[PDB]
């Protein structure tokens, strides 16, 4: 059975890495096995299941993966980001903390970590994360806006206002620039 397993594994992972998610599901389903667990197969089929609309199914494979390989950052990134997308903000936080510590130049991860924290009512911590994201991309208007909103939710209107104004200044630079390309 090994020749057969390795055929569907290699072909499936190839499809998934190329963005051929549907063909990745078709192939990797024929090798994935919960008892003889393989993290690279579970990761790619998880990705493929989320991309093709089986988001609960996919996240469950990613959860089984992160249980088997707790320090795998590529799993943690997918799964943490996917949690924010379905508002499982509380599960998202520990994964995104760990990914941000390992890849400190990943803007999206730090941004979504802030969003998760803000949703959980941890406004000072969200702001901390938003400020680190802003260090990475200081011309991101959405980050000042997110920081303004977290302040406002604490009743810190004085600290919010300069952030709203800066976000507006930056959004004017940005969306106009993109439309002129």
In CATH, what number is assigned to the domain containing residue 55?
1.25.40.10
Cβ atoms of 63 and 94 within 8 Å: the answer is: no
Cβ–Cβ < 8 Å for 28, 41:
yes
How many other β-carbons are positioned within 10 Å of the β-carbon of residue 174?
Answer: 14
1 domain-assigned = no
Resolution stated for this PDB structure, in Å: 2.0
The answer as to whether 42 is a domain residue is yes
Residue 89 has φ and ψ, to the nearest 5°, of -65, -35
Helix or strand run (H / E) with residue 94? helix 89-102
Torsion of CA 166, 135, 86, 17, to 10 degrees: 130
Does the residue 173 lie in any domain?
A: yes
Total number of domains in the chain: 1
Domain coverage including residue 41: 6-181
Asked whether the beta carbons of 136 and 126 are under 8 A apart, the reply is no
Smallest Cα–Cα separation from 163: which of 124, 132, 115, 127?
127
- 168 in any annotated domain: yes
Q: Is 162 among the domain residues? A: yes
3-state secondary structure at position 148? helix
Contacts with 140 (C-beta within 8 Å, 6 or more apart), sequence order: 107, 133, 134, 170
Helix%, strand%, coil% for the chain, nearest 5: 80, 0, 20
Residue 143 is assigned to a structural domain of this protein: yes
Task: Please tell me the distance from the alpha carbon of residue 110 to that of residue 31, in angstroms, as a whole number.
Answer: 34
Q: How far apart are CA 162 and CA 8, in angstroms?
A: 55
Do the beta carbons of residue 85 and residue 70 sit within 8 Å?
no
């Amino acid at each position: 059975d090994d020749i057969r397993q390795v055929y569907y594994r290699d072909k499936g992972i190839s499809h998934a890495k190329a963005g051929r998610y549907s063909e990745a599901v078709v192939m990797l389903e024929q090798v994935y096995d919960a008892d003889a667990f393989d993290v690279e197969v579970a990761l790619h089929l998880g990705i493929a299941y989320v991309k093709t609309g089986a988001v609960d199914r996919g996240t469950e494979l990613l959860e089984r993966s992160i249980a088997d390989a707790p320090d795998n950052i590529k799993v943690a990134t997918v799964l943490g980001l996917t949690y924010v997308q379905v508002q499982k903000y509380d599960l998202a936080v520990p994964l995104l903390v760990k990914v941000a510590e390992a890849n400190p130049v990943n803007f999206n991860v730090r941004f979504r970590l802030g969003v998760a924290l803000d949703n959980l009512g941890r406004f000072d911590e969200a702001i901390d994360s938003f400020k680190i994201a802003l260090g990475l991309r200081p011309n991101e208007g959405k980050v000042h806006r997110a920081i303004a909103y977290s302040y406002e939710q604490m009743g810190s209107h004085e600290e919010a206002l300069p952030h709203f104004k800066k976000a507006n200044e930056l959004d004017e630079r940005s969306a106009v620039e993109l439309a002129l390309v």
